[PDB]
Design a binder for this molecule. Sequence first.
Ligand code: HEM
Ligand SMILES: O=C(O)Cc1ccccc1Nc1c(Cl)cccc1Cl
Length: 402
Amino acid sequence: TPQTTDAPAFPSNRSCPYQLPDGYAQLRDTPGPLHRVTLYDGRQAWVVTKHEAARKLLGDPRLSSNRTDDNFPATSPRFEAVRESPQAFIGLDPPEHGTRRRMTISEFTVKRIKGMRPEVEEVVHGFLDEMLAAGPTADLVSQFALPVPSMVICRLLGVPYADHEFFQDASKRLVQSTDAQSALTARNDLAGYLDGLITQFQTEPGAGLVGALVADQLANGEIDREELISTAMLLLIAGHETTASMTSLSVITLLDHPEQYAALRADRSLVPGAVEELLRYLAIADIAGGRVATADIEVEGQLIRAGEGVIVVNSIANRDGTVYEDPDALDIHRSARHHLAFGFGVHQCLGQNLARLELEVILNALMDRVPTLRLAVPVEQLVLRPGTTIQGVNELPVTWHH
Ligand code: HEM
Ligand SMILES: O=C(O)Cc1ccccc1Nc1c(Cl)cccc1Cl
C-alpha cells in the first residue's frame, strides 16, 4: 500500500543549516497559497507557502495569535502544560496586543538602537578579546554567539547579568524542550526568578524595562504581575536566542560561500544588505508562524474555516521565486527587501532593529578581528536543531591562527 499523502507531516528538519528541507521545496513548488499538513498530534492544519499570501494572512485579523485556543496549530507539546500562564503580547490580538506592546516599544526605537551602538560594539569586542586570548579551538556558540546578545538584552531589561548561567540554561531548556514537563519546569524556573526581580524593584526602583514596568504600569494595575513575568520572559529569551542563532548560522553560511564572504570583507558598505539576505535565506523563526482562524477566510479559491490552524511558513515564503529571482541562491548583492524573516503586520518583530544592529556589528568584528576564522569540523558533522524550535546549532567548533 502506497504511503503518499496529501497532508505531509510538518514541520520538517534541515539537513544542511542553510538549505530548504526537501519536503519544503515540494511545498514551495506546488501552486497555490496554502497546503494541508499533519501536525505531531495527528491534527491537520494549513501552511502558507507563498510570499504575498503570507503578508495578506499575517495582516488579516481573522487569523488570531491566541495560543490558548484549543485549535491553535502547536507543532510540539511545548506549550500544552503552560497554558495556565498569561500570554505575552506575541499571543494577544488587538486591542490587548497594542496596549501591552506599547508598554515596551520605547526601548526599541531607531533612536535608542542608534544610542546602543557603543555598548553593542564594546560587548562584541570584549567577548572576542576573551575568546581570542584563550586561543583555538573554541565553541563559537557558548563563547560568543550567546553571551553577546544576552549581555545586551539584560541591560535593556534590567536583568542582572550575574545570573546568566541560570537564565541562559532555563531559556535553552524552554525553547528546545521536547516534552511538556521539561518546558513547564524551565518556564517555572524563569517565572520564579523574574517574580523575585519584580519584588526587588518594588523595594528598590531601578533601571531597565522591567524596572520601568514595575514602577509604572504594575503599580497602576495596568498589567498583571504574571503578565509582566511573561513579557519579560519573552523579551529575555527572544533577545538572546534569535541573534545567537543568526550569528552561528551566518558564520557557517558565509564560510560555505567564500567568494561572497570575501566580497563582504572588501566592501563593508555591503554588510547591511548581507544581513538582510542572511535573514531571508536562514529564516530561523517558522515556529512563530502559527495562527488560528476565528472566521472563515477565502484565499484564492481555498477556504480556511473558522477553527482551523494556519502556519505562515516564512522560510518557504522567503524562497518565493516571484519575489526573489533564483530564490535558493544566496546573493548578498541581491535585493532582499520585503522578506518575512521578522514577520509582517501588527506583530512584526519588536526587536528587529536591535537584531540588525547586533548582526552588523558582529559580522564586522569577526572580519576585523578573526579574518582567519574557520570551522574546526566539517559542516556535515554539525548537529542542527529540529524544525520544532528556533533553527540553528547548539555547538560550533571554530579555529583561527593563534
Ligand atoms: C535575530 C533575529 C530575529 C528573528 C529572525 C525574529 C523573528 C521574529 C518573528 C518572525 C516574529 C513574529 C511573531 C508573530 O508574527 O507571531 C517576531 C516577534 C517578536 N520578536 Fe523577534 N526575531 C529576532 C530577534 C528579536 C530580538 C533581538 C528581540 C528582542 C527582544 C525580539 C523580540 C520579539 C518580540 C517581543 C516579538 C513579538 C512582537 C509582537 O507580537 O508584537 N526578536 N520575531
Ligand atoms: O515559541 C516557541 O515554541 C519557543 C519560544 C519559547 C519561549 C519564548 C519564545 C519562543 N519562540 C520565539 C522566539 Cl525565541 C523568538 C521569536 C518568536 C518566537 Cl515564537
